Amino acid sequence: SVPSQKTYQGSYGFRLGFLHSGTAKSVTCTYSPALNKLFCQLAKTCPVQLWVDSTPPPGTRVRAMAIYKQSQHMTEVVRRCPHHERCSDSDGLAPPQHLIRVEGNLRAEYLDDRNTFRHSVVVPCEPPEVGSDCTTIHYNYMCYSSCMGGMNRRPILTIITLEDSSGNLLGRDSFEVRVCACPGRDRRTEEENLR
């Protein structure tokens, strides 16, 4: 099967937000609204904002999962390549196979789905800190888009779902991701190609 990627704000008006990091040669993570695409370096911090119109119930969680964007590959589990799954860079919590990690949250849980074998990482949905209007989750992508035997130059999407304590859908948003050496340059190139 294939997880849904349908945008769904739901009852709480759930949607993502991204910083405006620009396209300098030195940028490590940058988001293109025109492409709905995040460009980031390997294992670098990717700040993703969570916005809601009203506060979800205690026990609400936020899950991230990657799928291949092309229909020819959607059924294939997105995982780390044969090299990176063995490079012993575990944070002590993420399984070495998982492409997406959450940085600096000890309540992050990593799921290997017993049925679909797909990987995801889930955290409790926290209210914004005082003086803030949203909450930010920091993600890491632990393989290059180009890694042989892994993503192998195939584009992926990250699907973010807002879930109740049972795992039922409350909200959904998504964005394409390219993990690459020079995010600023590749964003500029792809945005030019678009126009």
Q: Which long-range contacts (CB under 8 A, 24 or more apart) does 1-5 make?
A: 1/75, 1/116, 2/67, 2/74, 2/75, 3/65, 3/67, 3/116, 3/118, 3/159, 4/159, 4/172, 5/67, 5/157, 5/159, 5/172, 5/174
Q: Is 46 labeled as ligand-binding?
A: no
Residue of this chain nearest to Zn ion (CB atom) = 147
- Shortest approach of Zn ion to residue 88 CB, angstroms? 13
For Zn ion, the closer CB: 81 or 160: 81
Q: Considering the rule CB under 5 A, would residue 147 count as an interface residue with Zn ion?
A: yes
Given the rule CB under 5 A, which of 29-37, 123-131, 137-145, 181-189 is the region that contacts Zn ion? 137-145
For Zn ion, the closer CB: 84 or 119: 84
Q: Considering the rule CB under 5 A, would residue 61 count as an interface residue with Zn ion?
A: no
Q: Is 147 labeled as ligand-binding?
A: yes
| Binding residues with Zn ion: total (CB under 5 A) | 5
Q: Is 189 helix (H, G, I), strand (E, B) or coil?
A: helix
- Shortest approach of Zn ion to residue 100 CB, angstroms? 13
Q: Is 81 labeled as ligand-binding?
A: yes
Contact pick of 37, 84, 119, 172 for Zn ion (by CB under 5 A): 84
Q: Is 165 helix (H, G, I), strand (E, B) or coil?
A: coil
Strand-pair category, 169-179 with 37-40: parallel
Contact pick of 16, 99, 143, 162 for Zn ion (by CB under 5 A): 143
- Shortest approach of Zn ion to residue 81 CB, angstroms? 3
For Zn ion, the closer CB: 80 or 172: 80
Beta strands in the chain (DSSP E): 15-17, 29-32, 37-40, 46-51, 61-68, 100-102, 109-112, 119-124, 135-141, 156-163, 169-179
- Residue 139: beta bridge partners? 46, 102
Contacts with Zn ion by CB under 5 A lie at 81, 84, 143, 147, 150
The binding site comprises 81, 84, 143, 147
Residues marked as binding for Zn(2+)? Answer: 81, 84, 143, 147
